[PDB]
């Protein structure tokens, strides 16, 4: 039913618009703001634990918005709470990663972090350039598709609503919704992207998204080895709950 597809699309699109930290408008006005040479140096002078703490707070902040996003998607709240938790636990960061492309500037390869745009050197203190570079490469490639907010809303919902996550109790139910979401995304893409490969190029990115987030987990596990007290008593409790 095309009518059901449209109701699902409007619901997700609306949830996205009401659950982003920065509306698309606020971002156009922030993209011109860039951290100065001094500010970049300050970030680089941070201890690895200090910057990790800052990044964990920002990621958690973004993750909390993804929870609000999920809670407003009617089809998601219809799943058993167990699968809701599983989907969020396994995909919150993946959604955040997709959403990051909204606040990324491919012209100079900079991203919004703590109020202004900064390059990858801004994260030098993390001691994880491989992770930063993979995150930036992903954002750059996604940005090249020139997606609209509706498409980012729908695609991000498909990344979250994955029937493939391990341990799901009702994967078919999740599968049925994801199918409808993709059907919606496919129609919405036509309003913009003439010709395309768009939907196919987006779906082909699913594994890369997960790869980046797994790398984040990997770096964090080693971070925990070196600084257990920081993770257990300074990192946001939700961040610890989700990734450690």
């Amino acid at each position: 039913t095309m009518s059901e597809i449209d109701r699902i699309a409007q619901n997700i699109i609306k949830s996205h618009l009401e659950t982003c930290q920065y509306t698309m408008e606020e971002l156009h006005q922030l993209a011109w703001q860039t951290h100065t040479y001094e500010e970049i140096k300050a970030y680089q002078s941070k201890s690895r634990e200090a910057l990790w703490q800052q990044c964990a707070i920002q990621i958690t902040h973004a993750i909390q918005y993804v929870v609000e996003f999920a809670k407003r998607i009617t089809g998601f709240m219809e799943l058993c709470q167990n699968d809701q938790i599983l989907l969020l636990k396994s995909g919150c960061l993946e959604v955040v990663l997709v959403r990051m492309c909204r606040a990324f500037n491919p012209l100079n390869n900079t991203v919004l972090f703590e109020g202004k745009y900064g390059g990858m050197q801004m994260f030098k203190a993390l001691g994880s350039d491989d992770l930063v570079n993979e995150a930036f490469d992903f954002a750059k490639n996604l940005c090249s598709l020139q997606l609209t907010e509706e498409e980012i809303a729908l695609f991000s919902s498909a990344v979250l609503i994955s029937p493939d996550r391990a341990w799901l109790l009702e994967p078919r139910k999740v599968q049925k919704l994801q199918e409808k979401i993709y059907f919606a995304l496919q129609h919405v893409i036509q309003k913009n992207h003439l010709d395309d490969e768009t939907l196919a190029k987006l779906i082909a990115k699913i594994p890369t998204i997960t790869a980046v987030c797994n790398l984040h987990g990997e770096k964090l596990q080693v971070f925990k080895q070196s600084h257990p007290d920081i993770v257990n008593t300074l990192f946001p409790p939700l961040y610890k709950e989700l990734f450690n």
């Binding site: 909390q64 929870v67 999920a70 809670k71 709470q81 809701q84 938790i85 969020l88 636990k89 409790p237 939700l238 709950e241 989700l242």
Partner: peptide
């Protein structure tokens, strides 16, 4: 997942 559970229940 106490925290995540709480946020969903809000």
């Amino acid at each position: 997942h106490k925290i995540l559970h709480r946020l969903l229940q809000e």
